[PDB]
Amino acid sequence: HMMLVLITYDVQSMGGTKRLRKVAKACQNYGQRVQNSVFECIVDSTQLTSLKLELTSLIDEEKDSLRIYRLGYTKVEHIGAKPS
Amino acid sequence: HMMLVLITYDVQSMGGTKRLRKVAKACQNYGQRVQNSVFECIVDSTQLTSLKLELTSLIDEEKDSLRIYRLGYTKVEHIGAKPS
Numbered sequence A, B: 001h002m003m004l005v006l007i008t009y010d011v012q013s014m015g016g017t018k019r020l021r022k023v024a025k026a027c028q029n030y031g032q033r034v035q036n037s038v039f040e041c042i043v044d045s046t047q048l049t050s051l052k053l054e055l056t057s058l059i060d061e062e063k064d065s066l067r068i069y070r071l072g073y074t075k076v077e078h079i080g081a082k083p084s
Helices: A014-028 A044-060 B013-029 B045-058
Strands: A003-010 A032-037 A038-043 A065-070 A077-080 B002-012 B031-035 B038-043 B063-071 B076-078
Touching: A003 A014, A003 A044, A014 A032, A014 A038, A014 A044, A014 B076, A032 B063, A038 A044, A044 B076, A065 B031, A077 B045, B002 B013, B002 B045, B013 B031, B013 B038, B013 B045, B038 B045, B045 B063
Parallel strands: none
Antiparallel strands: A003 A038, A003 A065, A032 A038, A065 B076, A077 B063, B002 B038, B002 B063, B031 B038
């Protein structure tokens, strides 16, 4: 029924900063920002599709990438500071 | 026996660029760089510990963070370009 999904956004620039803000807002609707451009979302199948379409539409595909990991869910270890 | 591990490195600066190079080299010993600062490693338990100690030692814990996800392993979707 519910899935944990990890979204990793590789973004650099003015456009980049703007796109990160938008991607973060879209992911926040379904989860939490755990690093500057890494998001953990908990979603059903319909919500995953909706979110993935939205994220695909927000990035610059020449300059950015996203990876979407379906985790199905084991302690994740966080090492170091933040995020802001 | 073997585990897939995802390593997400939140790093910014001159020191940052240097630390990313070192983290990437450490992860390359056990896997692949799939985005600028995201690495997929396949490791046994001993290798995971060794790698995690090494990564912890390389980062600046005031300015950077790492997350280490143990995936146990479902198509990951890559959207957009790269990495360099």
